[PDB]
């Protein structure tokens with residue numbers, strides 16, 4: 269099963285920079301969403317969930333086919349809440365209908381990370397929408413009620429190692445859980461991309477509690493929370509070393525996250541040898557916009 273990247277006909281960097289800019293301007297505009305968090309976090313999660321269905325064994329799932337647009341995936345219980353992100357991106361796709369769905373969904377994640385003062389994420393175009401019968405079944409995204417061993421084994425399906433896992437999880441600096449979406453009671457939220465997930469894990473006073481949905485979560489005296497899969501990163505000695513590394517090195521975290529996130533978003537895609545180089549988009553701030 270081979271998915272070959274095919275550049276949207278006649279498009280180049282500046283076309284995609286226009287899409288980035290539209291997403292970025294809408295992020296700035298629609299600032300009230302989710303108690304003034306804005307849409308950055310949910311767009312990052314969307315980009316991860318459209319990519320996280322991938323299976324290295326047969327190259328099913330992944331970001332290439334844009335299949336989140338289909339009911340079966342759109343309605344995956346693991347994707348509850350992501351419809352807000354889809355609706356946010358709707359007007360952008362209407363403005364730029366030439367872009368593929370996979371390209372738009374992944375680019376939304378990139379734009380969100382960057383506009384939230386995260387690292388630059390190189391991004392490649394060429395995902396091509398595939399038919400409804402290519403939509404992966406529900407159940408390929410990870411459970412949150414599990415331990416480090418579950419996390420490690422899960423991510424092997426996505427060809428991610430321990431450092432890549434720990435780095436990717438740092439996106440949980442962002443946003444929050446919503447009891448009605450996932451069965452987890454949200455704590456303090458952020459909308460700036462930092463290494464604070466690691467600092468919170470190491471520095472807060474955590475207590476294991478059972479929430480009103482009957483699920484276990486770790487809660488701090490200051491009002492933050494960790495999923496059991498988050499907290500597993502300080503229960504496992506291999507993960508803990510890396511958590512400490514990122515808590516003590518912002519730049520290393522940024523560089524490792526950027527690599528892992530691009531790789532996550534590109535898993536399953538064959539880029540021809542004469543494909544364009546990855547694009548590094550300028551932020552609104554860098555453009556004076």
Ligand code: HEM
Pocket residue numbers: 309310312313316348349410411412413419436437439440442443444445446447449450451452495497529
């Ligand atoms: C073991 C792996 C993971 C598990 C079990 C997990 C689970 C969760 C859950 C349960 C939520 C809350 C959803 C809601 O209630 O609205 C959430 C939110 C979020 N996740 Fe993850 N996640 C994992 C990995 C990741 C990765 C790899 C990324 C991206 C690189 C990511 C980015 C996010 C973001 C940005 C949010 C906040 C969304 C918002 O504020 O609406 N997560 N995750």
Ligand SMILES: O=C1CCNc2c1cnc1ccccc21
Pocket residue numbers: 440441442443444445455456457458464465468492493494495498
């Ligand atoms: O420590 C934080 C910061 C705010 N956001 C999250 C944290 C930890 N785990 C999370 C898990 C899912 C969504 C957001 C978070």
